[PDB]
């Protein structure tokens, strides 16, 4: 007698795991960037660079 | 005198903290100076008692 195609089922589970990373910014150089107070020579001037 | 020393303010910072009974605002700003004419530029008196 013949054969049938057999087939098997898996199951999986998916684990999870995260990671994570830091960096910081020091209060002096705050407002140097967004700060839109500098208003003619301090837009272009090194320090902000 | 009429003048005597040289002076520099900087910019305003903020600090927030929070806490239970409200919130902390504490606001700083830095400033320097410097005296610049060879000599002195000031003095005492010792006017009453």
Redesign the interface.
């Known amino acids: 007698p013949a054969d049938q195609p057999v087939h098997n089922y898996m199951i999986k589970r998916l684990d999870r795991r995260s990671l994570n990373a830091a960096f910081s910014i020091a209060?002096e150089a705050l407002?140097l960037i967004s700060?839109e107070?500098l208003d003619g020579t301090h837009i272009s001037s090194a320090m902000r660079l | 005198e009429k003048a005597s020393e040289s002076y520099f303010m900087g910019?305003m910072?903020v600090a927030r903290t929070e806490s239970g009974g409200g919130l902390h605002l504490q606001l700083t700003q830095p400033r320097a100076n410097v005296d610049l004419g060879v000599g002195f530029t000031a003095a005492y008196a010792a006017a009453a008692l």
């Open positions: 209060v407002g700060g107070n | 910019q910072q």
